[PDB]
Design an enzyme around this catalytic site. Structure first.
Site, PDB file in Angstrom:
ATOM      1  N   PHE A 131     -23.402  -3.262   6.195  1.00  0.00           N
ATOM      2  CA  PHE A 131     -21.994  -3.349   6.632  1.00  0.00           C
ATOM      3  C   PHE A 131     -21.227  -2.122   6.164  1.00  0.00           C
ATOM      4  O   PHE A 131     -21.244  -1.769   4.981  1.00  0.00           O
ATOM      5  CB  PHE A 131     -21.346  -4.641   6.138  1.00  0.00           C
ATOM      6  N   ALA A 132     -20.607  -1.426   7.108  1.00  0.00           N
ATOM      7  CA  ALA A 132     -19.858  -0.222   6.803  1.00  0.00           C
ATOM      8  C   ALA A 132     -18.485  -0.314   7.457  1.00  0.00           C
ATOM      9  O   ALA A 132     -18.321  -0.009   8.633  1.00  0.00           O
ATOM     10  CB  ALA A 132     -20.612   1.002   7.277  1.00  0.00           C
ATOM     11  N   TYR A 176     -15.777   2.879   4.014  1.00  0.00           N
ATOM     12  CA  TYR A 176     -17.203   2.826   3.678  1.00  0.00           C
ATOM     13  C   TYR A 176     -18.121   3.418   4.732  1.00  0.00           C
ATOM     14  O   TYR A 176     -19.313   3.639   4.455  1.00  0.00           O
ATOM     15  CB  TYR A 176     -17.676   1.414   3.329  1.00  0.00           C
ATOM     16  N   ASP A 215     -26.183  -3.182   0.563  1.00  0.00           N
ATOM     17  CA  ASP A 215     -24.882  -2.534   0.601  1.00  0.00           C
ATOM     18  C   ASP A 215     -25.038  -1.044   0.975  1.00  0.00           C
ATOM     19  O   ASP A 215     -26.068  -0.418   0.708  1.00  0.00           O
ATOM     20  CB  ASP A 215     -24.206  -2.634  -0.768  1.00  0.00           C
ATOM     21  N   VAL A 216     -23.982  -0.497   1.579  1.00  0.00           N
ATOM     22  CA  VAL A 216     -24.010   0.847   2.149  1.00  0.00           C
ATOM     23  C   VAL A 216     -23.752   1.967   1.141  1.00  0.00           C
ATOM     24  O   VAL A 216     -24.191   3.104   1.365  1.00  0.00           O
ATOM     25  CB  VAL A 216     -23.012   0.967   3.344  1.00  0.00           C
ATOM     26  N   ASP A 217     -23.027   1.664   0.058  1.00  0.00           N
ATOM     27  CA  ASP A 217     -22.592   2.663  -0.904  1.00  0.00           C
ATOM     28  C   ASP A 217     -23.696   2.889  -1.924  1.00  0.00           C
ATOM     29  O   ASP A 217     -23.523   2.731  -3.135  1.00  0.00           O
ATOM     30  CB  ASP A 217     -21.233   2.281  -1.562  1.00  0.00           C
ATOM     31  N   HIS A 268     -29.901  -8.237 -10.957  1.00  0.00           N
ATOM     32  CA  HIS A 268     -28.720  -7.415 -11.154  1.00  0.00           C
ATOM     33  C   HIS A 268     -28.959  -6.505 -12.358  1.00  0.00           C
ATOM     34  O   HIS A 268     -29.384  -6.994 -13.391  1.00  0.00           O
ATOM     35  CB  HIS A 268     -27.552  -8.323 -11.426  1.00  0.00           C
ATOM     36  N   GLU A 305     -21.855 -13.398  -3.643  1.00  0.00           N
ATOM     37  CA  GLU A 305     -22.865 -13.293  -4.695  1.00  0.00           C
ATOM     38  C   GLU A 305     -22.957 -14.558  -5.540  1.00  0.00           C
ATOM     39  O   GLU A 305     -24.051 -14.944  -5.972  1.00  0.00           O
ATOM     40  CB  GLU A 305     -22.562 -12.105  -5.596  1.00  0.00           C
TER      41      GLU A 305
END
Length: 278
Positions: free
Chosen positions: A60-61, A65, A144-146, A166, A236
């Site tokens: 997802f961007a 982002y 995640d994109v980042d 994590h 989460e």
């Protein structure tokens, strides 16, 4: 039906010599915990290529982002499932801002425009894209994109259902985990329960199992919304509740989700595979 592996020459595994003595490599429910040195990638590549496996990668961007897509995709090309069939699904509010990234053979990218924010990801995977994914890929990986890939992320992760440890909590006792602690939330986990703290930024599995997880999380989030409560860490928190009650069939070590600026490079990590962008 699984055809025979061909002849292969590789080092004999020795039952009186562990691969890794410094870490837990199997959960108490007999799921492998994936660390470097635990797998022979040549055997696994053979097994998964013989099944002509297709891996979907969802990302997802949204809003600013979109700027992270170029590095994300270019490094995925270098390191993610190379040699296997890959279908990227990029969910964005700005289709025109998706960078033109050159893909290796057998790899494709679909831009999916999106138009509740907290629930969007679980909703999209379980409701909107359900039939698409079942028709097009064997496994789904949700990240995640980042982020950027720095080293191998391959078919060693594939299994019916996986979560990732994590990086901030792999050494923590369960009472310190930031699970949702209010009994009024569907994500509630008491202080004496919990195996691991899984990060929402990297989970996956078979399409069927990922759709089961995302559907359950979406339903639980809707219940919480109707009851006027938002879990402490959003989807989460719900992912953690789901993976407590539905044990993952593999667990990825923090090699697969790391922040080097925050946490350095501990001895226990032989590789930093997929990392936060500074």
């Amino acid at each position: 039906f699984m055809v025979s592996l061909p002849r292969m020459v590789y080092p004999q595994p020795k039952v009186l010599t562990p691969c890794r003595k410094d870490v837990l490599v199997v959960t108490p429910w007999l799921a492998p915990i994936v660390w470097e040195g635990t797998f022979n990638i040549d055997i696994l590549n053979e097994q998964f290529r013989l099944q002509n496996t297709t891996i979907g990668l969802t990302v997802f961007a949204i809003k600013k982002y979109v700027a992270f897509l170029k590095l994300f995709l270019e490094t995925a090309e270098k390191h993610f499932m190379v040699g296997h069939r890959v279908h990227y699904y990029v969910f964005t509010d700005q289709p025109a801002a998706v960078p033109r990234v050159t893909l290796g053979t057998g790899r494709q990218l679909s831009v999916l425009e999106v138009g509740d924010v907290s629930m969007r990801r679980m909703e999209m995977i379980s409701d909107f894209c359900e039939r698409r994914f079942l028709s097009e890929v064997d496994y789904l990986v949700c990240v995640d994109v980042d982020m950027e890939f720095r080293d191998h992320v391959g078919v060693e992760i594939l299994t019916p259902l996986f979560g990732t440890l994590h990086p901030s909590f792999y050494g923590s006792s369960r009472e310190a985990f930031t699970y949702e602690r209010r009994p009024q939330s569907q994500a509630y986990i008491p202080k004496d329960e919990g195996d691991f703290y899984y990060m929402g930024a990297f989970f996956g599995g078979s399409v069927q199992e990922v759709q089961r997880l995302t559907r359950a999380c979406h339903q639980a989030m809707m219940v919480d919304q109707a009851n006027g409560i938002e879990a402490v860490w959003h989807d989460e928190s719900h992912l953690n509740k789901y993976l407590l009650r539905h044990k993952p069939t593999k667990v990825l070590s923090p090699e697969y989700l790391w922040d080097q600026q925050l946490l350095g490079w501990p001895a226990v990590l032989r590789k930093l595979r997929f990392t936060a962008v500074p």
